[PDB]
Structure formats: structure tokens, C-alpha cells
Amino acid sequence: TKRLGVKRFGGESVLAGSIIVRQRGTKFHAGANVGCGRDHTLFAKADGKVKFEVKGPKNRKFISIEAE
Amino acid sequence: AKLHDYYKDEVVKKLMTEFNYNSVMQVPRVEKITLNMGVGEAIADKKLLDNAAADLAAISGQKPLITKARFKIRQGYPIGCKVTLRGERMWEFFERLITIAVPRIRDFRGLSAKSFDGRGNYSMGVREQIIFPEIDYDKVDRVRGLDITITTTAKSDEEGRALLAAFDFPFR
Amino acid sequence: MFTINAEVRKEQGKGASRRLRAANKFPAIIYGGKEAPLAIELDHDKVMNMQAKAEFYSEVLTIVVDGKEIKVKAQDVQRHPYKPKLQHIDFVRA
Amino acid sequence: DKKSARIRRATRARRKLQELGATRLVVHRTPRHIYAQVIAPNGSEVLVAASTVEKAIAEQLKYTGNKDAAAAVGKAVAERALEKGIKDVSFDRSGFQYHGRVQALADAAREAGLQF
RNA sequence: GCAAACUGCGAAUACCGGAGAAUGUUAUCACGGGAGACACACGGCGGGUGCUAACGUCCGUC
RNA sequence: CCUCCUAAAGAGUAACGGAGGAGCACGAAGGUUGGCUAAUCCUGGUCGGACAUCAGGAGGUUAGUGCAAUGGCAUAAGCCA
RNA sequence: UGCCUGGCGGCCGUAGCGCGGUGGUCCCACCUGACCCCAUGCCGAACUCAGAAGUGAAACGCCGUAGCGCCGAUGGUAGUGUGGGGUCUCCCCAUGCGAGAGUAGGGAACUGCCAGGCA
């Protein structure tokens, strides 16, 4: 009777401490050289390249940052 | 370990010759014995549960642990406390019971062969706990009994029958 | 064993398929074994003519390509829900 | 299964340690022996390894598994690693309990000069 | 058998990010001055409302 | 104040369109380190009837994750110390 | 330089489930007793102490089993952008992108370093 989805994309260059994706649940998990917030908001720990992959026993989707 | 040596001396040889196993431990062996009176009458008050716990502590050589439910019972409601042994107390208590408890049963029609889990364990509840002399008549409050469920490594009902016969299996 | 001759497909996609369907023709494929499968162009009229006999789907058929007869077994046939037209016939080499 | 729970427990430690990309010093307890290895962050290569099975440790040990054997293994691995130049490496008890053989080995290694 | 608030499967157009060709008065952005501007409508594209009866009504796009 | 669709697969895209909940609390119901890993159904067992009780079995989270809703949690954010 | 085992990574179903036999050389697993280091919301269940006292029962190790699960082409089909047409509700034409399911087939995973036993 606020904004979800992918905001930053793989292959992009971002500065340190830049939020890439916020997720309602654990749809994605931070990879190497990536931090995680209280609301599962991933942010860049450094500057370089970003990769989205699928890995794990359940084949969960992961986000990683690699040196440029 | 009071009966452990006697068990290894007597039961092992007959079971091996009647089964012809290869390894020493292939013979079924008891691992734990469960004493838990399903009184189920402590819902009104917990004094009965305290009395049951005291009886368990007195009869056994240890102190019981209070559990909770998985009849008008809520979730997580403590109703009964169980007791189990793992070690020398196993054989000590088993020998004691088979010496004084099992032989001294009133109207002892026998055990229940069908009272198996279908996989190598026997479960039954023997009432009129007066059979156990450890039960002091001074502190008895109601007619109760142990819901003994023998836990054994038997892989089938035949092995359970064989290991029960090893204890002479008085009769059905 | 039936003397069936067809033409090898020259285009990949829905274009040639619809061109054949409009002109009363259709495509097909032949696969099976280590040999590479190949696409073929089956004429609709001849397929109707020689498929009426019940023996068409019973034994191993013979398909003639560029004057070369090969044994192929019809795996399956796909037809329109109501139109009596063969959407696609899949064969297996035998 | 005890193995399943042990692996489950060790997985959390390993995955939380992998964020740093630092050489790990993994110690494994066996009922009859004890194993200790130092593995690079990649995980496919090992810098050094020593176990009680080798004669170098069991010569003076009546048995390969006990507090004394764990201490001897810790001393040996610590000496070898110090020769290697660990420079404050990180330890890992394969997701085990720091109670016995693991505890004795770690204490013996720290006696030799381990910085962890 | 069904499911806009069913997905065990899963399209092209639409997005920015990286490399690359020719193009076009730099067609691109910021600042500073000066505007109108605060009632649009027809049709097509896929829908809701409405009784898909409506030449009724509202949405994103040309 | 907040959640689900409605809504044309980046975000947004009208309804007086249909669902709704929240005005709470913890000095633990947070953290540290350690340990453990359910629901669902079945077999035996006085009441207990099949499901007040424990042991075992298929399985490892469809239990639970304090608040309505939706996504997520096995490395457990779930339970104890 | 070969056969076998253990630890650690990539790999996350062509790695899983079902059946048979094979292993105590080394190694591995179960385990005796535990008052001793330690311990339970009760218990040597796990944890820790003396080892082979006993064994290969489960477990893991190889191979075969394609039974099961799984992947999976090839085409076609459905769908659809762009421009147009018709009897314009819906369909079709030209071109491009290209489903799901199913299919032949694959399918007893592969690979990297160290350590130990037998050649």
C-alpha cells in the first residue's frame, strides 16, 4: 500500500585510497593490495592496474590491484 | 582399564576365531557409554533437573553437563543433562554395571536384539534403577532408569550381535 | 545407401540459412570421428521426396559431395511447430 | 574429520598472511615426526626444509617426536635460517595449537635468535 | 502447470577504461561578461496507469 | 527514517501503484586470541504418542546471523571460552 | 635418471561421487598407558608426554572401471541493433552480432619446488 554496481573498471588507473565498488553483500572480495570497509566497500590501497577475476572453491568473484 | 586387559584376553580370541579378522582393532570396540535420563518433567521447575544432575554425579565418577533441546518446549530450553566417559572409566563402569547392575534386574525378560540403530549401536532404556545399588534409597524421588546407548565401532548389526555375545548376552 | 547428393555450404550465419529456406532449401551438418565436420546444403524438395519412405531413418544413408559418396547417419531432424518444413537435419558419419 | 577441520583452520591463517607477500615459516606436527619449512610468498618454492626423519636430527634422539626433538629441530632450522638471512620472517603453525612440539620448536628457534 | 516482486541457464544495441587508422574551422574542457529559459505538441520505439474500449493519461529515447 | 519490486540488463527514468518495517539497545549484543561448526528427515529407546531424551545415519549451512525487508557470512560476520 | 610417500603453490569439477585389489622398505595413519607439559562447559573426543606394544581396519596412495557427475564442440535455432516494407495489433526483407537445451567427443585432472625410502 544509494548506488550499487561497478564504479571503477579493470585496466583503469586510480590514486591511493580510491573506492572502486560498494556491494550490498559479499558479491565481491578484495584481492591482494586492496582493503575492505565496514559496508564491504573496496578501496584502492595503491596506484596501478585493477583486475576482476573469479577464483576460489566456490568460484567467487574477486577484485585485485597489481603494480602498474 | 579394570576389564580392558580381561577383555583383550578373552573376547578378542573368540571373536577372531569366529570372524577371522586381519588387524587387531578390526574387532568392534566400545568407545563411549551415554547415561541420560530422559525425565522430561523439569519444564515446570528445574529442581527435578538439579536432582537428576546430582544423581548422575553420584552414580558416575564425574559431573554431568547440562544440554538444551534441539511437547510444548521452546528453543534452547535446558531439560536434561547427559554423562559420557572416554578412557579407563569406560571399562571400570562397564565391569561394575555388568557385575552388580545387569545381573540384578527385576523381572529381567532379557535385552532387546531388535533395539539397534541399524549400523552397529544398541539403545535401550532400563527402568527401576533400584537395580544399581549405588542409587541410595534415601535420595530417590521417583521411579527412573538409565537410557543407556552403547556406542561401538561395529559396522553392522551382525557385529553388534557378536560383541554383545562376547559379554555373554544373557538372553533375549 | 540412398543416392543423395547435396552442395557444400559457402556462407556462415543466418543469411544463407534464410536464403535456402525461402527458396525451399535448408542447411545441414555432417560430423563424427576424427575427420573434421563439414556443413552441407540440402535441397528441401529432394529431402521431402526421399524421406517419405520409412527406411530413410532406418539404415545408414549415403551423401554425395563433389562426386564423393560417404556413409552418414541422420542424428536428428528439427521441424517447424506446425509448418511441415525441416528446420535443420543433423547427421553423423558412419 | 580432524584433517578437514585442521585444514579449514589453517586456511584462514594462510589467507590472512598472504596479504603481505612475506616468506612464511610453516611447521607441521606429525605423531611420529616433525616437519619445518620456509616457503617464499609464491608458495611453489621453498628456501629451506628440515624434518626429524633426516638422520641429522634423529641421531641423538631416541624418537623423532617429543619436546626434546621439537627443540632440536627448532635449533637446527633457526641456525640454518640465520645462515640464510631471514631478516625478521613470519612464523606459521600450520593452523595448529601452540601447546607442545610446536611450542618447543618455536621456543628453541627464538633462543637461537629468531626475530619473530 | 504458473510466477513484474521465480533463475538452476543466458543475447545485440548503452556505458566508461587501454591500444590502434583517417576524419572534421579544436568538432573537447575551465574560467569571465551577456542572454531567452522555467505551460511545448504530433508520430515512431518498449512499458505502466487506465476496462490495452479509448483519437484517455504518464514514463526513457529519436 | 529505511528496504523490495514497479522500471526498457552502466546510475537515474510517473503514479494517490502494491508491500511494508523502524522512534530500538549493548560498558556486550565490541574487540583480542583460542576452540567448535546447522537446518532437514530417518533408526533405537516408559510416559515420549513419530517429533520433551541421548547415540548413529544422508548432508555441510535451505538453521542461525537480536529488530521489517533484500544481499551476503564456511576464512565464518553463527556458538562458547 | 626412474617408482613410491609427505609438505607447500598455480589449478577449483576433463579435479567430485560409486565398485575391486594392491601398503608398511622408508614415510604416513590408527593407538597403549598417562599421576607426569596440558585438559575438558563430563570424558586422553581433540590438545600434550614414552614408541612401535599391535596393525594397515577407516584414511590416504596407483591403476582399471565412462556406472554417476561434469565439460563440450560443429551447425542450426530463438533473440536482436541498424534501414525499409506489408493486411503496420503482428510479420517480413538487407546486413551484422549471435541464445538456451541437445548433439559427436572429452572425461579416472594437469603442472611447479623441497624433503625422505627403493632402483
Author numbering:
A (entry chain W): 6, 15 to 81
B (entry chain F): 1 to 70, 76 to 177
C (entry chain V): 1 to 94
D (entry chain O): 2 to 117
Question: What text appears in the publication on this structure?
Answer:
The E. coli 50S large ribosomal subunit is composed of 33 proteins (L-proteins), one 23S and one 5S rRNA. The 23S rRNA consists of six architectural domains that, stabilized by the L-proteins, define the shape of the 50S subunit with its three protuberances. Here, we present a biochemical and cryo-EM based analysis of the earliest period of 50S assembly, utilizing an in vitro reconstitution system with purified rRNA and L-protein components. Taken together, early 50S assembly occurs in a domain-wise fashion, while late 50S assembly proceeds incrementally.
In addition, we noticed that the 5S RNP (ribonucleoprotein particle), consisting of 5S rRNA, uL5, uL18, and bL25, can dock on a pre-50S particle as soon as the central region of domain II has formed. This can occur both in early (d12-CP, d126-CP) and late assembly (C-CP) and goes along with formation of domain II helices H38 (A-site finger) and H42 (GAC), as well as domain V helices H80-H88, representing additional examples for rRNA induced rRNA stabilization or folding. However, the CP remains mobile and upon rotational movement of the 5S rRNA towards the subunit interface, H84 and H38 stabilize each other. The presence of domain II apparently facilitates docking of the CP-forming 5S RNP and as a consequence, route 1-2-6 involves the possibility of CP formation either on d12, or d126 resulting in d12-CP, or d126-CP, respectively.
